[PDB]
Amino acid sequence: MVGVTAFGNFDLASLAIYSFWIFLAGLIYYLQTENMREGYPLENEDGTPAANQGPFPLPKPKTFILPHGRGTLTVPGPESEDRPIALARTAVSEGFPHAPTGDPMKDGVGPASWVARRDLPELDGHGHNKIKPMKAAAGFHVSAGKNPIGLPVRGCDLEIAGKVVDIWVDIPEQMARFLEVELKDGSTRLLPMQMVKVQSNRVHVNALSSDLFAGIPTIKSPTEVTLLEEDKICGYVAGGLMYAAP
Amino acid sequence: ALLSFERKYRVPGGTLVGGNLFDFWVGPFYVGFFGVATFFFAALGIILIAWSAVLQGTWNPQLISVYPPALEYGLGGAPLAKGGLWQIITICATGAFVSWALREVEICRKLGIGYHIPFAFAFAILAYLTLVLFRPVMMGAWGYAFPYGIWTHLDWVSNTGYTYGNFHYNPAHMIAISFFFTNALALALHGALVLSAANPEKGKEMRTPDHEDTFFRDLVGYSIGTLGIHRLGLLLSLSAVFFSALCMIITGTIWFDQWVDWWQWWVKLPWWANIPGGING
Amino acid sequence: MAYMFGIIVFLAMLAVCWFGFMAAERQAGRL
Amino acid sequence: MSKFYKIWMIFDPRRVFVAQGVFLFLLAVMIHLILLSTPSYNWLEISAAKYNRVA
Amino acid sequence: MSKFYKIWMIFDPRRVFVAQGVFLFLLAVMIHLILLSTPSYNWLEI
Amino acid sequence: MSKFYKIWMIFDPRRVFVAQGVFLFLLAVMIHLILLSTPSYNWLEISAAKYNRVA
Amino acid sequence: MSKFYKIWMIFDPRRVFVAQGVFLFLLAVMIHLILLSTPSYNWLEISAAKYNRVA
Amino acid sequence: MSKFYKIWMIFDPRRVFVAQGVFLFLLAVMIHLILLSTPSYNWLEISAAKYNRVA
Amino acid sequence: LGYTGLTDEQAQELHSVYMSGLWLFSAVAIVAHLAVYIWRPWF
Amino acid sequence: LGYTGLTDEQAQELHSVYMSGLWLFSAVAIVAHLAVYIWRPWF
Amino acid sequence: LGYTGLTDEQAQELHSVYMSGLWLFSAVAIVAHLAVYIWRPWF
Amino acid sequence: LGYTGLTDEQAQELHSVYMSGLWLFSAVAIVAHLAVYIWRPWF
Amino acid sequence: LGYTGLTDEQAQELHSVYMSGLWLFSAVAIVAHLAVYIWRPWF
Amino acid sequence: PKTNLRLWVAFQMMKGAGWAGGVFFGTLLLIGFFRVVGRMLPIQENQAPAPNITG
Amino acid sequence: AEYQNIFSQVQVRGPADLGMTEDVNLANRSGVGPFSTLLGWFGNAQLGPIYLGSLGVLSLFSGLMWFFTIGIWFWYQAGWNPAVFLRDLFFFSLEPPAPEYGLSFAAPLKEGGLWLIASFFMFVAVWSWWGRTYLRAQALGMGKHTAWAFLSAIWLWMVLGFIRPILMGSWSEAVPYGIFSHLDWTNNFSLVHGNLFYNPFHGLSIAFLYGSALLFAMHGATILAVSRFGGERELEQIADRGTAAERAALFWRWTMGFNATMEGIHRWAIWMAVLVTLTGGIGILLSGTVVDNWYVWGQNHGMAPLN
Numbered sequence A: 001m002v003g004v005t006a007f008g009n010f011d012l013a014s015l016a017i018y019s020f021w022i023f024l025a026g027l028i029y030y031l032q033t034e035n036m037r038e039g040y041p042l043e044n045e046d047g048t049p050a051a052n053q054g055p056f057p058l059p060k061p062k063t064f065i066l067p068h069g070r071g072t073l074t075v076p077g078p079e080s081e082d083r084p085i086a087l088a089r090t091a092v093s094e095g096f097p098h099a100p101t102g103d104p105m106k107d108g109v110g111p112a113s114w115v116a117r118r119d120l121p122e123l124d125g126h127g128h129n130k131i132k133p134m135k136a137a138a139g140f141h142v143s144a145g146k147n148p149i150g151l152p153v154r155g156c157d158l159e160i161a162g163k164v165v166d167i168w169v170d171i172p173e174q175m176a177r178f179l180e181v182e183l184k185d186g187s188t189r190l191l192p193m194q195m196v197k198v199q200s201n202r203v204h205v206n207a208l209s210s211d212l213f214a215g216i217p218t219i220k221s222p223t224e225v226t227l228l229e230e231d232k233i234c235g236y237v238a239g240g241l242m243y244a245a246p
Numbered sequence B: 001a002l003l004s005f006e007r008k009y010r011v012p013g014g015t016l017v018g019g020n021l022f023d024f025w026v027g028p029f030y031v032g033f034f035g036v037a038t039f040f041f042a043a044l045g046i047i048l049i050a051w052s053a054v055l056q057g058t059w060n061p062q063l064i065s066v067y068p069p070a071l072e073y074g075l076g077g078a079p080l081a082k083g084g085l086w087q088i089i090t091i092c093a094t095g096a097f098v099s100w101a102l103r104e105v106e107i108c109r110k111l112g113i114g115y116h117i118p119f120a121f122a123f124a125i126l127a128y129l130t131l132v133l134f135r136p137v138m139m140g141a142w143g144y145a146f147p148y149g150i151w152t153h154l155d156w157v158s159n160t161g162y163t164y165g166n167f168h169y170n171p172a173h174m175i176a177i178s179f180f181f182t183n184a185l186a187l188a189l190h191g192a193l194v195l196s197a198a199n200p201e202k203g204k205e206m207r208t209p210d211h212e213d214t215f216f217r218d219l220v221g222y223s224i225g226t227l228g229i230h231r232l233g234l235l236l237s238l239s240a241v242f243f244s245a246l247c248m249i250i251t252g253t254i255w256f257d258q259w260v261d262w263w264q265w266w267v268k269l270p271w272w273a274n275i276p277g278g279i280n281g
Numbered sequence C: 001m002a003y004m005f006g007i008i009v010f011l012a013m014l015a016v017c018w019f020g021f022m023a024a025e026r027q028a029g030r031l
Numbered sequence D, F, G, H: 001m002s003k004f005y006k007i008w009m010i011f012d013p014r015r016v017f018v019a020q021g022v023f024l025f026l027l028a029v030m031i032h033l034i035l036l037s038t039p040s041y042n043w044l045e046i047s048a049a050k051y052n053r054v055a
Numbered sequence E: 001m002s003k004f005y006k007i008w009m010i011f012d013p014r015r016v017f018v019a020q021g022v023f024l025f026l027l028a029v030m031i032h033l034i035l036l037s038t039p040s041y042n043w044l045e046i
Numbered sequence I, J, K, L, M: 001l002g003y004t005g006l007t008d009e010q011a012q013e014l015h016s017v018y019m020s021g022l023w024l025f026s027a028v029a030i031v032a033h034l035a036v037y038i039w040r041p042w043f
Numbered sequence N: 001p002k003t004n005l006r007l008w009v010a011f012q013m014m015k016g017a018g019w020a021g022g023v024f025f026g027t028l029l030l031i032g033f034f035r036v037v038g039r040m041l042p043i044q045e046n047q048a049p050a051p052n053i054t055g
Numbered sequence O: 001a002e003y004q005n006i007f008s009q010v011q012v013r014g015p016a017d018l019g020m021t022e023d024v025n026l027a028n029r030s031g032v033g034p035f036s037t038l039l040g041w042f043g044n045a046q047l048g049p050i051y052l053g054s055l056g057v058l059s060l061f062s063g064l065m066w067f068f069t070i071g072i073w074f075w076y077q078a079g080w081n082p083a084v085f086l087r088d089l090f091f092f093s094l095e096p097p098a099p100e101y102g103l104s105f106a107a108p109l110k111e112g113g114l115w116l117i118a119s120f121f122m123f124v125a126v127w128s129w130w131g132r133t134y135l136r137a138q139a140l141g142m143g144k145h146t147a148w149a150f151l152s153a154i155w156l157w158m159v160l161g162f163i164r165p166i167l168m169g170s171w172s173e174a175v176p177y178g179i180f181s182h183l184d185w186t187n188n189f190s191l192v193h194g195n196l197f198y199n200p201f202h203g204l205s206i207a208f209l210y211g212s213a214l215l216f217a218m219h220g221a222t223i224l225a226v227s228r229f230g231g232e233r234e235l236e237q238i239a240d241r242g243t244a245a246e247r248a249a250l251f252w253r254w255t256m257g258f259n260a261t262m263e264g265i266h267r268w269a270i271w272m273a274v275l276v277t278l279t280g281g282i283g284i285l286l287s288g289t290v291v292d293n294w295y296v297w298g299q300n301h302g303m304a305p306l307n
C-alpha cells in the first residue's frame, strides 16, 4: 500500500485525514448542541427572545429521571427566573451593566446572586439527608487537622462575630461542609467551609465584616439544610467580597 | 443576547483598571481595560504574521513561518524581515496572553468566584516565556527560541531535542510526560464516570455520587471523591507544565552533553560500578 | 510628472476637508 | 448623507469611540511597521545610508 | 474645537487620564525600543 | 414504491434536508477535485495547452 | 422468506435506516477508491490511454 | 416548483440566509484562489507578462 | 403518525415537492454529464 | 426608532462634532502624506 | 408487540416499502455490474 | 402549519424577495462568466 | 447623553486644563525632537 | 482653585504611567536576572548549535 | 492570603462506608481497607472495599504472570545478582523475536519466546480488565462510558503490540518490555519512518493530549473556583442547577464567548481524552504500512517545503 494513490497525492493516509475532518466537524456540532440544554433560548435584556439565536439549533429534549421519587427533569425546557431581580438598567443600549436598585447583598444580585433551587435537602444513595450537623451522626469525629469547634470567628474588620459550635458534615463524602457559628444573640448561622481560614487560634472569614454575619440567611430547620438554603447562604457570603465596604 | 439566567449577574464593578470606562459587554464577550489591551495585541500580532507571509512569499498557511533573529544578532534587535518581526510578535503574544489572564481576574471579581482559572493559565504563560524569553536570554541569543510556524516549530523541537541525543533521557522531561499521560487518563475517567451516572441504563434513575464512589472502589479499591478529582486534574496539569519548563531551562544551560550519559551516575556508584554481569558489566 | 500632479491632488483633498469641516461647524451651532 | 447622523441612534458612542480608537491606532502602527519592513521606505536606514552611519 | 470638551460628558475623566498615562508611557517605551533595535540608533551599544 | 413518501413519517425533514445538502456538496466538491487532480481532465490545464497559454 | 417482516418489531427502523445508509455509502466509496487505485481499472487512466490524451 | 416557497415553513430564514451568505462567500473565495493558484489564469501574472512588468 | 407526527397529507405534499426538486436537480446533472461525455468521453 | 436613547437633535449634535474631528484628523493626515510625497513619492 | 412498539400490521407495511426499495436498488446494481463486466471482465 | 410559525402568505412573501435576490445575483454572475469566456475561454 | 454626570461648565473648565497640558507636553517633545535632529537627524 | 485641578490631572496620569513603568522595569529586571545567571554558567564554552535553518 | 480549597483544613472520619448494592454480587466484595490520613488531606481517606469475582481473578492472575515473567527475565539478565539487578534495572529488556522469525512462534525462549509468553499474559490481563470495567458498571446500572473510553486506549496498545506487527509481518516490530528500551523503540520508530512529527495523526494526537491538559486545568480550576457554592457536587448541579453552575457558565461565556453545561463539559472531557489514542492508533497503523517517510509525505502534501 506504500505509495498507492487513487488520484493525485491522495493515498490511504489522505483518505484517513479527510475522513477525520468530517468526523471532527460532526463531533463539534454534537458537542455544542449538547451544551445548549441549559440557558437557552437567548434573551434580550428585557427578557424577550433575542432575534439572534446563533448558528446551532436547540437539541431535542432529553428527560432525566430523578431518584427518591423527585420526578423528572426535561432539558431544554421552560426556564423562567422564577424570582424577582432587583436590578435597573444603567443604559438604554444593550451590553451595559445593570445597577442594584437597593441593597444587593439582601436582594441577592450580582456576586450575591442565588438560584431558586429545590427547597429540599440533597439526599445520599440510601435517601438520608446527605449533609448533617456532626452531633447528629454519632460515628463522626474530627480525625485530623485543627478542630475549629470552640474557636472565635473573626471578620475582615478584625472583630469577633461569634464562635464555632458545630461542623456540618457531608456523610457519604465524609468531609466538612459548613461551620455553624453562634452569634452574639445566640442565633446560629452556617458558613461555607471554603470561605473560612481555620487559623491556629481563630477562624477568619475574609468575606464578611463582623456586623454582616447577622445578615446571613438562616436555615428553617436546625437539623437539615435545603438546596435553596445552601444557595442563599453561599451566594450571600461570596457577595461580601464585592459589597462588604470598610 | 443573554443566557436566560444571565441578567442578574451583569452588575457594575470588579474592574481592576478603568472603573466604568470599559465596564461593558460586546455580545457575550466582556471587555474591560484588559479586553481592549488584549484585542489590540492579538490583532497586531496576527496582522504582522500575515505581513510576514507576504515577505516570505507564500500563502499556504502551513508553510508560513516567522523565524527569530539568527544567532549572530545575539540578544540585540534584528531587521524586521530577518528576525525583527518575530520579536514584535513575541511582544504582542506576551501582551495578549498577560492581558487575557488579567481580564480573567476581572471576570472572577465580578462573579465572586475564586482566582484558580487565571492562576492556572499563568503556568502556560510561564512555559511560553521559558521557551521564547528566559532560556534564550540565558543562552544569549533570540535564535534559540522557536519559530512561529505550524510545522516549522516542530523542526525546532526536533533539532533542539536531537542536539542532546534522544531527549527521552532528560529526567525532568520523563516526569513531565508522566504527568501528561496521567492527566489524560484522569480526564477520560472523570468524564466517563460523571456521564455514566447522569446517563444510566435506559429507564433507570440518575445515579448518585454514592454510585460513583462505589464503582471506582469496586474497580480499583479506592475513590478520590468529587472534590479530590478536581484537585487532582488541576495539579496534574500544572505539574506537567512545571516539569516541562524545568526540563528546558536546564537543557543547554547546566547540561550540555547527551542526556543518556547523565544516567551513568547511577551505574557508576562505587558500591556496584565494577560488579560483573548485567547490561553495564 | 506624478510629482507635480501629486502635489495638486493632495492640495485638492485638503479643500474637501476644509469644506466638510466648515460644513460640520455650520451644522454644529444647533442648525 | 444627511441622515448618517442616525448611526448614533443605532450605536452608543461610548462603545463606538473605544472601537474606533483601537482601530485607528492599530491601522497606523501596522502601516509604520510595514514601511519599516521595506528597504525603500525604512526612514531610519535611509538616513543611515545618507549620513554614512552603520548600514 | 467648538465642542470637543463634550468628550468629558461621554467618558469619565478620572478613568481616561489614568488610561492615557498608561498609553503614553507604553508609546514612549515602544519608540525607544524601535530605535534601540536599529543599529544606527542603538545608544546602549557603546 | 408508491409509499416511499411515508419516509417523512419516519424521519424529520429538517434533519434530512440538512444532511442531504451537506452530503451532495461534499460529494460534488470531491468529484471536481478528482478531475482537477487528473491531468487528462483538469479543464484549466487542458485549455492552457489548446491555446498555448504557457511558454 | 415471507415472514422476515417482524424484524421491524425488534429493531427501531430509524436506527436501522441510518446505520444501513451510512454502511452502504462507505462500502461503495471504499470499492470505487480500490478501483481508482488499481491501474487496470482506473477508468480515468484507461480513457486517457485509449484517446491518447496524456502527451 | 409551484410549492418550493414552503421551504420557509421548514427552515428558519434567519439561519438559512446566514448559512447561504457564508457558503456563497467561501465558494467564491475558493474559486478565485484556485485561479490565482493556476499559472494560465492568475490574472496578475498574465498582465505582468503582457505588459513586460517583470521582464 | 410514526415518529415525526406529520399527517399523511403533509408527507404526501412534502414528498411531492421534494421529488420535484430531486427530478429537477438530477435533470440538470444528466445534461451536464451528456455535455461532458460528448466533449470528452471517459469510456 | 432608537436603540441608544439619543433624541434626534442629540444625535445631530454628536454627529456634527464627530465629523469635525474626522475632517480635522484627515486634514492633518493629508499634510503628512503631502510632506512624505514631497520627500519620497510612492507613485 | 416486539420491543419497538410497532404494530404487526405496521411492520408488515413498512417491510413492503423497504423491500421494494431494496429490490429497486439491487436491480440497478445488477445492470451496473453487467455493463462493467461486458466492458472489462474481472474473471 | 409548519415549524417556523411563518404563515403561508408570509412564506410566499419571503420567497418572492429571496428569488428576486437569486435572479439578480445570477444575472451578474452570468455576465461575469461571459466576459471571462470572451476574454479567455476555458473550453 | 451626559453619561459622566459632569455639567457642561465643568467639562469646559476641565478641557482647558487638559488642553493646556497637551500643548505643554508636546512643546517639550518638540524641544527634545529638535535637540535629537541637531545631533543625529533622521531625514 | 484651577491649580488643584491641574495637579489632579497630572496625578491621575502619573498613576497610570507609574504602574506601566513598574511593569516595564520589573520585567527588565527579570530579564536581567536570567542574563546574570547566564553569565555565571559555562555556556560560552559549551555553546549549542543553532536550531533553526535561518541560523 | 485566603483559602484556595486545594488541601482540606479539617478531616472528619465517620464509620466505614460500604457503598451502593444495586445488583452487585455482595459475596464478591471484600471488607473495607484502612483509612489513610495522608490521602485525606487531598481526597478521600478510605481505602477499599474492592470487588473481585471472575474477570477480576482472571485479570489479576494473568497480570501477575505478565509481571513475573518480565521480572524473572530481568533477574536472569542480572545474573541473579541482587546488586546488578538494582544497578541495571532500567537497562534490562525483554525483546521481541528477531526479524528472521517473522510471525512464527518458533523463536527460542532467549531470542523472543519469553516475549511471546509475556505478551500473551498481557493480552489476557488487559482484555479481561476491560470486561471487568464493563461489568462493574452494569452491576450498578451505570452507563458504559468508562468501558468505551478504555477501549480507545486498548486500540493504541493493540496497534503497537499486535495489529501493526501482524500487518508488517514480524513480531520484531512490537515494543520491548523495559524502561529505557521502550523509549529507544519510540525514538527508533520515528527515525525509521522519517520524522513522526510530519505524521498528521501524531500531530492530532498531540493536539488532543495538550487539549486534555488544557481542558482539565480549565475544568479543575473552574470547579474549585465555584466550590464555595457546592459546584463540586456536579450531579446535583445537573439535576438542580445552582448558582455554582451559572457562575461557571458565565465565566467562560464572558471570557471566550461560549460555554458548557455541568453535564456537557464532561462530554468535552471524555472526547478530548479519547481522541488522543484513537487518532494515535491510526497514525501508528499508517506508519510503514502506508507511509515509510512522513517528511517526504509532508512535502507532497503542502506542509513541508520542497527540495
Ligand SMILES: CCCCCCCCCCCCCC(=O)OC[C@H](COP(=O)(O)OCC(O)COP(=O)(O)OC[C@@H](COC(=O)CCCCCCCCCCCCC)OC(=O)CCCCCCCCCCCCC)OC(=O)CCCCCCCCCCCCC
Pocket: A028, A032, A042, A052, A053, A054, A055, A056, B001, B026, B027, B028, B029, H022, O256, O257, O258
Ligand atoms: C487551527 C485549528 C483551530 C481550532 C480552534 C478550536 C476548535 C475546537 C473548539 C470548538 C469551539 C466551538 C465554538 C462554538 O461552539 O461556537 C458556537 C457558540 C454559540 O454561541 P451562542 O451564544 O449560543 O450563539 C451565538 C450568538 O448568539 C452570540 O451572541 P451575539 O450574536 O449577540 O454575538 C456574536 C458573538 C460571536 O459570534 C460570532 O462571531 C458569529 C458566530 C460564530 C460561529 C462560529 C462557528 C460557526 C461559523 C464558522 C465559520 C464562520 C465563517 C465566517 O460576539 C461578537 O460577534 C462580538 C464581536 C467579537 C467577535 C469578533 C469576531 C471577528 C471575526 C473573526 C472571525 C470569526 C470566525 C468565526 O459560540 C459562538 O458562536 C461564538 C464563539 C466565539 C469564539 C469561537 C472560538 C472557537 C473557534 C472558532 C469557532 C469554531 C470553528 C473552528
Ligand code: BCL
Pocket: B157, B181, B184, O125, O126, O153, O154, O156, O157, O160, O185, O186, O187, O188, O189, O190, O195, O196, O197, O201, O202, O205, O206, O207, O209, O276, O277, O279, O280, O281, O283, O284
Ligand atoms: C523521537 C520520538 C518521537 C515520537 C514518537 C512516538 C511514537 C512512536 C508514538 C508516539 C505517540 C504519542 N506521542 Mg510522539 N514522538 C515524538 C514527539 C512528541 C512530542 C513532543 C513535544 O516532541 C509529544 C507531546 C508527543 C506526544 C505523543 C502522544 C500524543 C502520543 C501517545 C498518546 C498516549 O496516550 O500514549 C500513552 C498511552 C498508551 C500507550 C496506551 C496504553 C493503554 C494500555 C491498555 C495500558 C496497559 C497498562 C499495563 C497493563 C500496566 C498496568 C499497571 C497497573 C498498575 C495495574 N510526541 C518524536 C517525534 N510518539 C504514540 C502515538 O499514538 O503516535 C501517533 C506512539 O505510538
Ligand SMILES: CC[C@H]1c2cc3[nH]c4c(c3C)C(=O)[C@H](C(=O)OC)c4c3nc(cc4[nH]c(cc(n2)[C@@H]1C)c(C(C)=O)c4C)[C@@H](C)[C@@H]3CCC(=O)OC/C=C(\C)CCC[C@H](C)CCC[C@H](C)CCCC(C)C
Pocket: B038, B041, B042, B043, B044, B045, B046, B089, B092, B093, B096, B097, B100, B104, B117, B118, B120, B121, B123, B124, B147, B148, B149, B150, B151, B153, B237, B238, B241, O210, O213, O214, O217, O218, O221, O255, O256
Ligand atoms: C497550564 C496547563 C495547560 C493550559 C492551561 C490553560 N490554558 C488556558 C487557560 C488555562 C487554565 C485559560 O484560562 C485560557 C483560556 O481562555 O482557555 C479557553 C487558556 C488558553 N490556552 C490556549 C491555548 C493553548 N494552551 C496550551 C496549553 C496549556 N494550557 C497547558 C498544557 C497550548 C499548547 C500548545 O500546549 C495551547 C495552544 C488558548 C485557547 C487560551 C488563551 C487564549 C489567549 O491568550 O487569547 C488571547 C490571544 C489571542 C486570542 C491570540 C493571540 C495572537 C498572537 C498575538 C499572535 C500569535 C503568536 C503565537 C506565538 C504564534 C504561534 C504559532 C504556532 C504554530 C507556534
Ligand SMILES: CC[C@H]1c2cc3[nH]c4c(c3C)C(=O)[C@H](C(=O)OC)c4c3nc(cc4[nH]c(cc(n2)[C@@H]1C)c(C(C)=O)c4C)[C@@H](C)[C@@H]3CCC(=O)OC/C=C(\C)CCC[C@H](C)CCC[C@H](C)CCCC(C)C
Pocket: B181, B182, B184, B185, B188, B189, B192, B219, B220, O059, O060, O061, O063, O064, O067, O125, O126, O127, O129, O130, O133, O146, O147, O149, O150, O152, O153, O273, O274, O275, O276, O277
Ligand atoms: C483514552 C486514553 C487514556 C487512557 C484511558 C483509560 N485507561 C484506563 C481506563 C481508561 C478510560 C480504564 O477504565 C482503566 C482503569 O481501570 O483505570 C483505573 C485504564 C487503565 N489504564 C492503565 C494504565 C495506563 N493508561 C495509560 C494511558 C491512557 N489511558 C490514555 C492517556 C498509560 C500510559 C503509558 O500512558 C498507562 C500505563 C491502568 C491503570 C488501567 C488498566 C489496568 C489493567 O489492564 O491491568 C492489567 C493488570 C492487572 C490487573 C494486574 C497487574 C499485576 C499487579 C501487580 C497485581 C498483582 C496481584 C496478585 C494477586 C499479587 C500476588 C503476590 C504474591 C507474591 C502474594
Ligand SMILES: CCCCCCCCCCCCCCCC(=O)OC[C@H](CO[C@H]1O[C@H](CS(=O)(=O)O)[C@@H](O)[C@H](O)[C@H]1O)OC(=O)CCCCCCCCCCCCCCC
Pocket: B073, B074, B075, B076, B087, B088, B090, B091, B094, B095, B132, B133, B137, B139, B140, B141, E044, N027, N028, N029, N031, N032, N035, N039
Ligand atoms: C530612569 C531609568 C534609567 C535607565 C538606565 C538605562 C538602563 C539600561 C539597561 C537595562 C538593564 C537590563 C537589561 C537586560 C539585561 C542586559 O544587560 O541585557 C543586555 C543584552 C545584550 O547582550 C549582549 O551581550 C550578552 C553578553 S553580556 O551579558 O554582556 O555578558 C550576549 O549574550 C548577547 O548576545 C549580546 O546581545 O540584551 C538583552 O538581554 C535583551 C533585552 C531584551 C528586551 C526586549 C525584548 C524584545 C525581544 C523579544 C522578547 C519579548 C519579551 C516580552 C516580555 C514582556
Ligand SMILES: COC(C)(C)CCC/C(C)=C/C=C/C(C)=C/C=C/C(C)=C/C=C/C=C(C)/C=C/C=C(\C)CC/C=C(\C)CCC=C(C)C
Pocket: D003, D004, D005, D006, D007, D008, D009, D010, H025, H028, H029, H030, H032, H033, J001, J002
Ligand atoms: C479570494 O481572491 C480575491 C480576494 C483576490 C478575490 C475574491 C474576493 C471576494 C469573493 C470578494 C467579495 C466581495 C463582496 C461579497 C463584497 C460585498 C460588499 C458589500 C455588500 C458592501 C456594502 C457596503 C455598505 C456600506 C458601506 C453601507 C453603509 C451604510 C451607512 C454608512 C449608513 C447606515 C445607516 C444608518 C445610519 C441609518 C440608521 C437608521 C435609523 C432609523 C436610526
Ligand SMILES: COC(C)(C)CCC/C(C)=C/C=C/C(C)=C/C=C/C(C)=C/C=C/C=C(C)/C=C/C=C(\C)CC/C=C(\C)CCC=C(C)C
Pocket: B036, B037, B040, B091, B094, B095, B098, D017, D018, D019, D021, D022, D025, E007, E011, E016, E020, E023, E026, E027, E029, E030, E033, N020, N023, N024, N027
Ligand atoms: C481627550 O480624549 C482622549 C483623546 C484622550 C480619549 C478619547 C476617548 C477614548 C476613550 C478613546 C479611546 C481610545 C482607545 C481605546 C485607544 C487604545 C489604544 C491602545 C490599545 C494602544 C496600545 C498600545 C500599546 C503599546 C504601545 C505597547 C507597548 C509595549 C511595549 C513597548 C513592550 C514593553 C512593555 C512592557 C513590558 C509593559 C507592558 C507589559 C507587557 C507584558 C507587554
Ligand SMILES: COC(C)(C)CCC/C(C)=C/C=C/C(C)=C/C=C/C(C)=C/C=C/C=C(C)/C=C/C=C(\C)CC/C=C(\C)CCC=C(C)C
Pocket: F020, F024, F027, F030, F031, F034, G025, G028, G029, G032, G033, H003, H004, H005, H006, H007, H008, H009, H010, I010, I013, I014, I017, I018, I019, I020, I021, I022, I025, L002
Ligand atoms: C468520490 O466518489 C467516488 C470517486 C468514490 C465515486 C463514488 C461516489 C458515490 C458512492 C456517490 C454516491 C452518490 C449518491 C448516493 C447520490 C445521491 C443523491 C441524492 C439522493 C440526491 C437528492 C437530491 C434532492 C434534491 C436536490 C431535492 C430538493 C428538494 C427541494 C428543494 C424541495 C424541498 C421540499 C419542500 C420545500 C416542501 C416543504 C413542504 C411543506 C409541507 C412545508
Ligand SMILES: COC(C)(C)CCC/C(C)=C/C=C/C(C)=C/C=C/C(C)=C/C=C/C=C(C)/C=C/C=C(\C)CC/C=C(\C)CCC=C(C)C
Pocket: D024, D027, D030, D031, D034, E003, E004, E005, E006, E007, E009, E010, J013, J014, J017, J018, J019, J020, J021, J022, J025, M001
Ligand atoms: C497592508 O494593508 C493596508 C494597511 C495597506 C490596508 C489598507 C486598506 C484599509 C483596509 C484601510 C482602512 C482604512 C479606514 C477604514 C479608515 C477609516 C478612518 C476613520 C473612520 C477615521 C475617523 C476619524 C474620526 C475622528 C478622529 C473623530 C473625532 C471626534 C471627536 C474629536 C469628537 C468626539 C466627541 C465629542 C467631543 C462629543 C460630541 C457631542 C456630544 C453632545 C456628546
Ligand SMILES: COC(C)(C)CCC/C(C)=C/C=C/C(C)=C/C=C/C(C)=C/C=C/C=C(C)/C=C/C=C(\C)CC/C=C(\C)CCC=C(C)C
Pocket: F025, F028, F029, F032, F033, H024, H030, H031, L010, L013, L014, L017, L018, L021, L022, L025
Ligand atoms: C473545487 O470545486 C470547484 C470550485 C471547482 C467546483 C465546486 C462545485 C460546486 C459544489 C458548486 C456549488 C454550487 C452551488 C450549490 C451554488 C448555489 C447557489 C445559490 C443557492 C445562490 C443563491 C443566491 C441567493 C441570493 C443572492 C439571495 C439574496 C437575498 C436577498 C437579497 C434578501 C431577501 C430577503 C429579504 C428581503 C427578507 C424578507 C423578509 C420578510 C419578513 C418577508
Ligand SMILES: COC(C)(C)CCC/C(C)=C/C=C/C(C)=C/C=C/C(C)=C/C=C/C=C(C)/C=C/C=C(\C)CC/C=C(\C)CCC=C(C)C
Pocket: D025, D028, D029, D030, D032, D033, E024, E027, E030, E031, E034, M017, M018, M019, M020, M021, M022, M024, M025, N005, N006, N007, N009, N010, N013
Ligand atoms: C510602529 O509605529 C512606530 C512605533 C514606528 C511609531 C508610532 C506611530 C504611532 C501610531 C504613533 C501615535 C501617537 C499618538 C496618537 C500619540 C498621541 C498623544 C497624545 C494625544 C498626547 C496627549 C498628552 C496630554 C497631556 C500630557 C496632558 C496633560 C494635562 C495635564 C497634566 C493637566 C495640566 C497640568 C499642567 C500643565 C501642569 C502639570 C503638573 C506638573 C507638576 C508639572
Ligand SMILES: COC(C)(C)CCC/C(C)=C/C=C/C(C)=C/C=C/C(C)=C/C=C\C=C(C)\C=C\C=C(/C)CC/C=C(\C)CCC=C(C)C
Pocket: O067, O068, O070, O071, O072, O074, O075, O116, O119, O120, O122, O123, O157, O158, O159, O160, O161, O162, O175, O176, O177, O178, O179, O182
Ligand atoms: C522483585 O523481583 C520480582 C521478580 C519479584 C519482580 C520484578 C518486577 C519487574 C522488575 C518488572 C518489570 C517490568 C517492566 C519494566 C515492564 C515494562 C513494560 C513496558 C514499558 C511496556 C510497554 C509497551 C508494551 C506494549 C505496547 C505491549 C503490547 C502487547 C500486546 C498488544 C499483546 C499482544 C499479544 C501477543 C503478541 C501474544 C500473542 C500470543 C498468542 C499465543 C496468540
Ligand SMILES: [Fe+3]
Pocket: B190, B194, B230, O219, O223, O234
Ligand atoms: Fe467535573
